Each structure stands twice: as structure tokens, then as C-alpha cells.
């Protein structure tokens, strides 16, 4: 907040001021659980693609 100084009279003796502000926030995060398993059933009797 900056604002413009409004003119006042030397003999009246008057003036201005200014406040201040502070806040706070928080943050959560994301989680991932990629899982996978291998078994002998994927090797027993299955031929490789592209080969005889």
C-alpha cells in the first residue's frame, strides 16, 4: 500500500499513516505406488516374438 500524500495546511498541523499485513499457508503433496510382479508362468513355454 503506497498512496499519494494529500496536501494539508501548515498551521493546522495534520498528517497520515499506514498498516501492514502478514499471512501463512500450507501445502500437501501427491503419492504414487506403482507396483508389479513377475512369475515363472511368463517364461514357461512362451516363445520370443520375432523368432521361430
Amino acid at each position: 500500500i503506497s498512496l499519494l500524500d494529500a496536501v494539508d495546511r501548515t498551521s493546522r498541523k495534520a498528517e497520515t499513516s499506514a498498516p501492514e499485513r502478514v499471512r501463512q499457508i500450507s501445502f500437501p503433496m501427491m503419492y504414487f505406488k506403482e507396483v508389479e510382479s513377475i512369475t515363472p508362468d511368463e517364461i514357461q513355454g512362451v516363445r520370443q516374438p520375432g523368432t521361430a
Binding site: 501548515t10 498551521s11 498541523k13 498528517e15
Partner: protein, 52 residues
């Protein structure tokens, strides 16, 4: 307007330090007494983007 500043050359800003009674704090004052002007106002011309 001050006891020590009367019939004396002015200055862009007047920052004053004052002490509150019985060490209660500090208060400030900032004065200024100025006037910008042009001695040949006929040289100040504004332009507009519309017809006469």
C-alpha cells in the same frame, strides 16, 4: 514551521526524530513545503488522438 527553521532555506524533506515520554517509544515527522511550476507555460502543449 519549527523554532529552529524560520526564515531559513527550505529543503526537500524534513525528517524529525522525537522521543515519547518516559521511554514509551519513538514518533517521527516528515515535512515538505514545495511547489513545481513552469515560467513559460506556452511551451507545455498536450496532444490528442481525435479531430479538432
Amino acid at each position: 514551521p519549527k523554532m529552529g527553521y524560520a526564515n531559513t532555506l527550505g529543503q526537500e524533506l524534513y525528517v524529525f526524530e522525537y522521543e515519547k515520554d518516559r521511554d514509551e517509544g519513538i514518533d517521527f515527522e516528515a515535512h515538505s513545503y514545495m511547489l513545481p511550476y513552469c515560467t513559460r507555460p506556452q511551451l507545455l502543449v498536450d496532444v490528442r488522438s481525435d479531430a479538432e
